[PDB]
């Protein structure tokens, strides 16, 4: 029965620790799953973030992806839903630390809400994260998506690199796992792919330290006849 038909707006709130650097972050936004299109600002609610927001991008909602008329059958985020799912993964950053989150998406009434515990240990002080060396961009992936038969849900693993300003790479290896609340109701997909392009703003007013983030998701990579 599941019905992202609207434009449902969203609430994201993360609590993070970085090498015993407390900090929290609360986005709302909205997003529009027919045209998988999606728009969010985030802010940090603990002063000034100890990491670069582009870190955070893919832990800060799978579900908002347009998936084409004919693979519907396939869209496991939506399935799973209101009961909602758990994104768990861990992040290690090539030659630097690691991040674990896990997540809880689900709604809330009429909002669609992802709460992240993330938790990262032992970055280097002067590294490309630590030390805030990385461009404020957001590179392309085409995120590969595989059924889990046994925990009932579905991983996925790639490799962002985030761009850093001296003209080098920081490599963030992802391994992801995803797995619903409830039990009975879930689509199992073949494996397909999901293209998703991002956009990182500032608004002009926003004292505080905040990202604004557009996001284009779109899911293919079954074909027929």
Same mark, same amino acid.
């Given at each position: 029965?599941?019905?992202?038909?609207?434009?449902?707006?969203?609430?994201?709130?993360?609590?993070? !620790?970085? %090498?015993?650097?407390?900090?929290?972050? =609360?986005?709302?936004?909205?997003?529009?799953?027919?045209?998988?299109?999606?728009?969010? /600002?985030?802010?940090?609610?603990?002063?000034?973030?100890?990491?670069?927001?582009?870190?955070?991008?893919?832990?800060?909602?799978?579900?908002?992806? =347009?998936?084409?008329?004919?693979?519907?059958?396939?869209?496991?985020?939506?399935?799973?839903?209101?009961?909602?799912?758990?994104? @768990?993964?861990?992040?290690?950053?090539?030659?630097?630390?690691?991040?674990?989150? =896990?997540?809880?998406?689900?709604? @809330?009434? !009429?909002?669609?809400?992802?709460?992240?515990?993330?938790?990262?240990?032992?970055?280097?002080?002067?590294?490309?994260?630590?030390?805030? /060396?990385?461009?404020?961009?957001? %590179?392309?992936? %085409?995120?590969?998506?595989?059924?889990?038969?046994?925990?009932?849900?579905?991983?996925?693993?790639?490799?962002? =690199?985030? %761009?850093? @300003?001296?003209?080098?790479?920081?490599?963030? !290896?992802?391994?992801?796992?995803?797995?619903?609340?409830?039990?009975?109701?879930?689509?199992?997909?073949?494996?397909?792919?999901?293209?998703?392009?991002?956009?990182?703003?500032?608004?002009?007013?926003? /004292?505080? !330290?905040?990202?604004?983030?557009?996001?284009?998701?779109?899911?293919?990579?079954?074909?027929?006849?």
């Amino acid at each position: 029965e599941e019905l992202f038909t609207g434009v449902v707006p969203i609430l994201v709130e993360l609590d993070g !620790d970085v %090498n015993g650097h407390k900090f929290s972050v =609360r986005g709302e936004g909205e997003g529009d799953a027919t045209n998988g299109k999606l728009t969010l /600002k985030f802010i940090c609610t603990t002063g000034k973030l100890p990491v670069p927001w582009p870190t955070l991008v893919t832990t800060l909602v799978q579900c908002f992806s =347009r998936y084409p008329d004919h693979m519907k059958r396939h869209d496991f985020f939506k399935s799973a839903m209101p009961e909602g799912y758990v994104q @768990e993964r861990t992040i290690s950053f090539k030659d630097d630390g690691t991040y674990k989150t =896990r997540a809880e998406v689900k709604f @809330e009434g !009429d909002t669609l809400v992802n709460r992240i515990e993330l938790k990262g240990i032992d970055f280097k002080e002067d590294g490309n994260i630590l030390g805030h /060396k990385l461009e404020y961009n957001f %590179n392309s992936x %085409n995120v590969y998506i595989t059924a889990d038969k046994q925990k009932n849900g579905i991983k996925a693993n790639f490799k962002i =690199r985030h %761009n850093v @300003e001296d003209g080098s790479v920081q490599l963030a !290896d992802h391994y992801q796992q995803n797995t619903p609340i409830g039990d009975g109701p879930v689509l199992l997909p073949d494996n397909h792919y999901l293209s998703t392009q991002s956009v990182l703003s500032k608004d002009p007013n926003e /004292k505080r !330290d905040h990202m604004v983030l557009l996001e284009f998701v779109t899911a293919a990579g079954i074909t027929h006849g």
